[PDB]
């Protein structure tokens, strides 16, 4: 039984950390794509300005 | 003349344009270096988890190899 | 007995698991800020370019 007790209680906090983590590298992964769509964005538009000047 | 108040008046509008181009310049670089310290902070979050953590496996290793020794033992 | 086993064995599993997930949280940050340094950088550029065109 105290076998028991134990290794359901450390069961459960690893979970719960496992699940945490989840929500963390998810919400960390949309900040980074969304920094990744702004750089792509920033990049097109800097070539849009460089061949605006090759116009004029 | 139409020309000199024409002059003056995109000559105030470049220099108030400049002016907020260097102020938007620096607050997306005190923003910029709020993020670098955010950085920082997160490496160190990195590294004292890493340490953690590998402590939490060396007595977790500790533990299953004692337990596995009394295992082959019995 | 059964009880025990299974949950040291699913512990075992969390904590591998748990652990593989902090490998992929360390580096998806630091891609992250490595990314946002390249980033500002390219700010600094322009904000560079930006005191250029003061001469506007």
């Known amino acids: ?56 | 003349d139409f020309d000199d108040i024409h002059r003056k008046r995109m000559e105030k509008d470049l220099n108030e344009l400049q002016a907020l181009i260097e102020a938007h310049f620096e607050n997306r670089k005190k923003e910029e270096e709020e993020l670098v310290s955010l950085k920082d902070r997160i490496e160190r979050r990195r590294a004292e988890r890493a340490e953690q953590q590998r402590i939490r496996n060396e007595r977790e290793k500790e533990r299953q190899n004692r337990l596995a020794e009394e295992r082959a033992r019995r």
Chains 1, 3 share one sequence.
């Open chain 1, 1 to 56: 039984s105290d076998k028991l007790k134990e290794a359901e209680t450390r069961a459960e906090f690893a979970e719960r950390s496992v699940t945490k983590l989840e929500k963390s590298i998810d919400d960390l992964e949309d900040e980074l794509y969304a920094q990744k769509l702004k750089y792509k964005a920033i990049s097109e538009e800097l070539d849009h300005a460089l061949n605006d000047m090759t116009s004029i």
